[PDB]
Amino acid sequence: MNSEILNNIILNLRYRDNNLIDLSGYGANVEVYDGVELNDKNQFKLTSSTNSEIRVTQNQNIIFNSMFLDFSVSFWIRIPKYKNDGIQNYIHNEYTIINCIKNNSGWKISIRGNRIIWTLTDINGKTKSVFFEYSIREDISDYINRWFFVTITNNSDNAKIYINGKLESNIDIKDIGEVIANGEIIFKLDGDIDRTQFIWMKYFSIFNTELSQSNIKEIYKIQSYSEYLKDFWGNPLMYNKEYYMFNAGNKNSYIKLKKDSSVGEILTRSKYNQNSNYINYRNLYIGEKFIIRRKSNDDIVRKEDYIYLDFFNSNREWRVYAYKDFKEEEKKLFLANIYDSNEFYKTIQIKEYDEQPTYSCQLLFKKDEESTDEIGLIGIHRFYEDYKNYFCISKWYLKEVKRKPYNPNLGCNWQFIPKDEGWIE
Ligand SMILES: CC(=O)N[C@H]1[C@H](O[C@@H]2[C@H](O[C@]3(C(=O)O)C[C@H](O)[C@@H](NC(C)=O)[C@H]([C@H](O)[C@H](O)CO)O3)[C@@H](O)[C@H](O[C@H]3[C@H](O)[C@@H](O)[C@H](O)O[C@@H]3CO)O[C@@H]2CO)O[C@H](CO)[C@H](O)[C@@H]1O[C@@H]1O[C@H](CO)[C@H](O)[C@H](O[C@]2(C(=O)O)C[C@H](O)[C@@H](NC(C)=O)[C@H]([C@H](O)[C@H](O)CO)O2)[C@H]1O
């Protein structure tokens, strides 16, 4: 990790012993109230409950306001989807999530529907705001209810917002005077919110430098790294959990067992079809309900694990298999009940070929016996009937995944979508 990053951390809020602590080395006081849900993946949840609050008292014995002339804030956030019957309140109602104010001066992070807002107030009461807005009209959003990485950088001249390491917003703040930035930091939802409103956050940090684009991309990569695969939302991928399947190479496509058949046909997602012309999305809770089974201390799926890919068909667990008789470059997968056959492969190795941050994984068929032989990767392909798109195994992907840079648009890139309280359709 670049010393430009490490040498300049003045607040580093991290999970420790069923608590959040400052690990910067400056010793800020952190009070987590009983309404904050914490987990050992460093995620914390702010709710509408009066006791859902974190109070951080910066160490004013060591931390001087002059340190915040150039400064940056980074965190990950997961902001739930609008309620389809609540779109007006979503669009209009601004709520604070993090507030650092002394005598009406300081900095604030707030949300209004689909925008995240950075506000600076100087000691004269002169305010300037910069914001990031993500679309609520995309077929498939990178942002709605999914973990993403925010970095805000400030110097005398500019306030910038980066999202997943890329610049999204930039305002001139030359006219903004002295900002008191060393006060108490309050993590708490504050505004005209529904009872059901919540925000997830992770890895909240403050740096007493203006982080470079280079520095921000490095933090994004380091904080993205895991030994475990992730789901579509960015949470750890789990065994024994029901998941819809998403194809990162054909985002509007889903798998359905073809009626009375043993193959998965690829169909096009339905779309939001109610009144509001403010919103558009493709349905996520569609197609077969899959479940990942261990082939042989936690239920987390790790890179290189051996798995069965199963799904529920008419009240019974079925399995995804690949025919051993496989002369062509691609072949439809065989969907059937759970049984052993010398005629098919059942064992999948779950892979991450991508070097760059991603929630996609890849699914490699192997022989039952612990062998280095690679059969093929699960993907999509058009087969002669006109041509029709099917759930397939492909030898073609074996060479494509070895190409640099890794192509995230390959049809062998899958994500697993569990039902989530932050996504109601
Ligand atoms: C386009 C095509 O049909 N590709 C299939 C390929 O067909 C061979 C010839 O195609 C090329 C090619 O890949 O483009 C032509 C190049 O010139 C070749 N390059 C060389 C030699 O350097 C290249 C290579 O030879 C091979 O790739 C091997 O490495 O092949 C194609 O032109 C030719 O077409 C014939 C046709 O078959 C005949 O019917 C017709 O009469 O004549 C034409 C012209 O001759 O056929 C060639 C083989 O006979 O063959 C490979 C198998 O080797 C694949 O089938 C390939 O198609 C790809 O298959 C995989 C599954 O294995 C997927 O289905 C790919 O689709 C996806 C995916 O990755 O899953 C779907 C995704 O939705 C999509 N993402 C998007 C749109 O966001 C991705 C994405 O487009 C690509 O991954 C690239 O980013 O594709 C499917 O493309």
Author numbering: 856 to 1151, 1157 to 1245, 1252 to 1291
What does the report in the manuscript say about this coordinate set?
Botulinum neurotoxins (BoNTs) are bacterial toxins produced predominantly by Clostridium botulinum. The heavy chain contains two domains: the receptor-binding domain (HC) which is responsible for targeting neuronal cells at the presynaptic neuromuscular junction, and the translocation domain (HN) which transfers the LC across the endosomal membrane within the cytosol. BoNT/B, /G, and /DC instead bind to either Synaptotagmin I or II (SytI or SytII). BoNT/B2 from Clostridium botulinum strain 111 was first identified in a case of infant botulism and initial characterization found its toxicity to be approximately 10 times lower than that of BoNT/B1.
Separate crystallization experiments containing only GD1a and HC/B2 were successful in producing crystals in the space group C121, containing the ganglioside-bound complex which diffracted to a resolution of 1.8 Å. The electron density for the entire GD1a carbohydrate is well defined. Our GD1a-bound structure of the HC domain from BoNT/B2 reveals a highly similar binding conformation of both GD1a and the HC domain when compared to BoNT/B1. Neu5Ac5 forms hydrogen bonds to N1273, N1275, G1104, N1105, G1277, and Y1263. Gal4 hydrogen bonds with His1241, I1240, S1260, and E1190, and also forms stacking interactions with W1262. GalNAc3 forms a single hydrogen bond to E1190, and Neu5Ac6 forms a single hydrogen bond to W1262. When comparing with the B1-GD1a structure, the central Gal4 superposes extremely well, but minute variations in the position of other monosaccharides are a potential result of differences in surrounding loops. One such difference is residue 1275 which is a Lys in B1 and Asn in B2. In our ganglioside-bound crystal structure, we observed a potential water-mediated interaction between N1275 and Neu5Ac5 which may result in improved binding affinity. Adjacent to N1275 is P1274 which replaces a Leu in B1 and likely provides more rigidity to the loop in an orientation that could favor interactions with the Neu5Ac5 moiety.
